[PDB]
RNA sequence: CGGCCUCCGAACGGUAAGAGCCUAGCAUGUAGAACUG
């Protein structure tokens, strides 16, 4: 390798990062074979991390060789794949998996080291679903240590040097507790991923009306910095518009459309996020 | 040392019959008897 | 029963007043040596030994240099008989290294990046006061 | 390093006298006339054998 | 430079480990094993410095 | 004046092969860990 592949969270904060290398250090639980191991000092009194997957095992799905989440968005791989509608055929059984890994490394040897191989580019339409489920700031709780089992029973007699966060241990009844690393990599029943599914299912999106002839769309929360041509340029080449009523006595709008699916495109993509000159409009189908 | 495994043609000893006959390079012997370590171990555990 | 004496030559004549201190330090080195690792083994297993060693050789460091209560030739005998630590002492004699805990705490090769233990950095530069445990000695900011 | 010693002749003569037992009371090599490495090499090559020598 | 140690250091480690049965050490297991390739060096070294009977 | 003095012992080939079965060990010591108008 040249260096690891991991997100900013796993990657660190200080401008000068310190990581030690060992060639052929241990076994990628994916490629199953020896890899290089680079070990990075995450943060002040924060657990030193290490590279935990073959670089090819990484370029396969385009995820973090330490943080394990995708490198573009940073959600569970099950999620990110489905958010691209992506459907990978990676084999599972022992002999099948070894044959797959061998030919995979052969096929990746013909690469230039810039981007993951295969459908990872022909699924690069990062949907606003993924964009919105994407975390914003570095959830740097990751580099805090374990539960110092001594310090959970009382025993951690080393003073403050408990090797692990001497807090209350999580009740493993939580589905967010035991996610086998191999399953999390295979996209195999990640309960955290199902939580992201429930969250991105309950997260607000624009609603559909009943009758097809309701082609009037009310956009609530306009303000008096908007123009009718600006409401147009928001919803104009996204189809054809038939008319628009910019209600200044109520600070809203209403686009009567010329294509129903065009209306759907503009409005559903616009739900609360059509931010032209900074005003939170609400795209709905009018009365 | 203690020369540990005596040479007890086990086909003979258990079934009274060795297929090799005269050439069996072991000892034709059907005698059950406490060994060179059985007794040591039982007594010390006693 | 003591560290049986090899040279066969008679110890010079300040030995008799460090006598019981040396004897006792040896006895408790023996006891802290045979001491069982009930959570005091592993990383902290030798935490006690260097303690006793540095202890003894500091004692002799005083009693020859800071008091001059002892003869040169006696103290020579008492290094050559393995109580003291001639190299630890020849460093202790330095300007910033008065309390260097274990002579391995400045071994630059003993560490991957080519430094010393944080056991050597003076605490004022740290400003974080987080308890510092140099793994080797366990020591607490020798400097 | 413990190399390259120099010694006094008193020392040497005393030592000599002390190691007198494990030593050869020979003064020269006209003893080993037909009994030296080269004689043995010739013998070995000719398959002959000196009375008291190897074969 | 690399510098010497008190003998009691090693003595403590070694009487500590004893015969590697205690689940405490459990990794020096495999390092101990791997050290076998050099056991014929240790023996030659030990035996060529033996104490020459006039010294005790 | 004659001298002439080999050697040396162990292993395999010999007391089946098996699937199941069950439980120590032996290995692991990791990775992660949740959010709004
Ligand atoms: Zn028989
Ligand atoms: Zn230190
Ligand atoms: Zn130290
Ligand atoms: Zn120190």
Contact call for residues A140 and A88 (beta carbons, < 8 A): no
Contact call for residues A221 and A282 (beta carbons, < 8 A): yes
Please judge whether E6 and C107 are an interchain contact, meaning their C-beta atoms are less than 8 angstroms apart: no
CA-nearest residue of chain C to A159? C131
Q: How far is the CA of A15 from the centre of ligand 4 (A)?
A: 29
Q: Which residues of D4-23 are buried (b: 16+ CB within 10 A; e: fewer)?
A: eeeeeeeeeeeeeeeeeeee
Please judge whether E6 and C109 are an interchain contact, meaning their C-beta atoms are less than 8 angstroms apart: no
Residues 19-58 of A with CB under 8 A from C: 20, 45
Experimental method: cryo-EM
Is the CB of E26 inside 8 Å of chain C's CB atoms? no
Q: What is the CATH number of the domain that holds A281?
A: 3.30.70.330
**Protein CA A179 to sugar C1' F33 (Å):** 10
Q: Which residues contact A2 (CB under 8 A, 6 or more apart)?
A: none
Instruction: Count Cβ atoms below 10 Å from residue A206 Cβ, excluding itself.
Output: 17
CA-nearest residue of chain A to C138? A158
The residues placing their C-beta within 5 Å of ligand 3, an ion, are: C 101-102, 105, 119, 134, 136-137, 139
Give burial (CB, 10 Å; 0-12/13-18/19+) of E6: buried
- Chain E residues lying within 8 Å of C41, measured CB to CB: 16, 24
Q: Phi/psi class of residue D14: alpha, beta or left (left: φ > 0; alpha: ψ in -120 to 50)?
A: alpha
Please judge whether C107 and E2 are an interchain contact, meaning their C-beta atoms are less than 8 angstroms apart: yes
Give burial (CB, 10 Å; 0-12/13-18/19+) of A147: middle
The secondary structure of A102-122 as a DSSP string is HHHHHHHHTS-SSS--GGGTT
Task: Give, for A283, the enclosing helix (H) or strand (E).
Answer: strand A282-283
Biggest CA pair distance of chain E: 45
Containing domain of residue A225, as a range? 216-285
Distance from CA of C113 to the nearest CA of E (A): 16
Is the CB of C39 inside 8 Å of chain A's CB atoms? yes
Which residue precedes each gap in chain B (C to N above 2.5 Å)? none
Q: How far apart are CA C30 and CA C28, in angstroms?
A: 5
- Chain C residues lying within 8 Å of E8, measured CB to CB: 29, 33, 49, 52-53
The secondary structure of A224-268 as a DSSP string is TT--HHHHHHHSSSSS-EEEE--BTTTTEEEEEES-HHHHHHHHH
Is the CB of E9 inside 8 Å of chain C's CB atoms? yes
Q: How far apart are CA C2 and CA B33, in angstroms?
A: 55
Q: Please report the resolution in angstroms.
A: 4.2
**Termini Cα distance of chain A:** 61
């Amino acid at each position: 390798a040249d260096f690891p592949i991991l997100c900013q969270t796993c990657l660190g904060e200080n401008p000068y990062i310190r990581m030690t290398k060992e060639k052929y250090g241990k076994e990628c639980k994916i490629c199953a074979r020896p890899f290089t191991v680079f070990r990075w000092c995450p943060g002040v009194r924060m657990r030193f991390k290490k590279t935990e997957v073959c670089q090819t095992c990484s370029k396969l799905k385009n995820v973090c060789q330490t943080c394990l989440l995708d490198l573009e968005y940073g959600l569970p791989i099950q999620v990110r794949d489905a958010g691209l509608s992506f459907k990978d055929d990676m084999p599972k059984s022992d002999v099948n998996k070894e044959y797959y890994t061998q030919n995979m490394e052969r096929e990746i040897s013909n690469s230039d080291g810039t981007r993951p191989v295969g459908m990872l580019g022909k699924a690069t339409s990062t949907s606003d679903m993924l964009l919105k489920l994407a975390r914003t700031t570095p959830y740097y709780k990751r580099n805090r240590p374990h539960i110092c089992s001594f310090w959970v029973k009382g025993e951690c007699k080393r003073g403050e040097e408990c090797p692990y966060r001497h807090e209350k241990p999580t009740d493993p009844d939580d589905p967010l507790a035991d996610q086998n690393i191999k399953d999390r990599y295979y996209g195999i029943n990640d309960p955290v991923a199902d939580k992201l599914l429930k969250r991105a299912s309950t997260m607000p999106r624009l609603d559909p009306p009943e009758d097809k002839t309701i082609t009037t769309l009310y956009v609530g929360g306009l303000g008096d910095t908007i123009t009718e041509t600006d409401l147009r340029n928001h919803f104009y080449q996204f189809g054809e518009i038939r008319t628009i009523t910019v209600v200044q006595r109520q600070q809203c709008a209403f686009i009567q459309f010329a294509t129903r699916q065009a209306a759907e495109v503009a409005a559903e993509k616009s739900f609360n996020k059509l931010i032209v000159n900074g005003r939170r409009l609400n795209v709905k189908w009018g009365r | 040392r203690w020369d540990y495994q005596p040479d007890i043609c086990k086909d003979y000893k258990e079934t009274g019959f060795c297929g090799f006959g005269d050439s069996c390079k072991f000892l034709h012997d059907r005698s059950d008897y406490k060994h060179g370590w059985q007794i040591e171990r039982e007594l010390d555990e006693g | 029963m003591p560290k049986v004496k090899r040279s066969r030559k008679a110890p010079p004549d300040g030995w008799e007043l460090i006598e019981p201190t040396l004897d006792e330090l040896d006895q408790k080195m023996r006891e802290a040596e045979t001491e069982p690792h009930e959570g005091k083994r592993k990383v902290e297993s030798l935490w006690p030994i260097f303690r006793i060693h540095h202890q003894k050789t500091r004692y002799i460091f005083d009693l020859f240099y800071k008091r001059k209560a002892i003869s040169r030739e006696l103290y020579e005998y008492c290094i050559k008989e393995g109580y003291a630590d001639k190299n630890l002492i020849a460093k202790w004699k330095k300007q910033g290294y008065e309390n260097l805990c274990c002579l391995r705490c400045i071994q630059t090769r003993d560490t991957n990046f080519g430094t010393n233990c944080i056991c050597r950095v003076p605490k004022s530069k740290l400003e974080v006061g987080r308890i510092i445990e140099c793994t080797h000695c366990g020591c607490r900011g020798c400097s | 390093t413990y190399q390259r010693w120099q010694f006094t002749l008193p020392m040497m003569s005393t030592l000599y006298r002390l190691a007198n037992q494990l030593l050869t009371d020979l003064v020269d090599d006209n003893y080993f006339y037909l009994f030296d490495l080269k004689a043995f090499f010739t013998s070995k090559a000719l398959n002959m054998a000196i009375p008291g020598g190897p074969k | 430079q690399k510098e010497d140690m008190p003998p009691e250091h090693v003595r403590k480690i070694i009487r500590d480990h004893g015969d590697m049965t205690n689940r405490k050490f459990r990794h020096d297991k495999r390092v101990y094993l791997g050290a076998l390739k050099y056991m014929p060096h240790a023996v030659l070294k030990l035996l060529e410095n033996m104490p020459m009977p006039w010294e005790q």
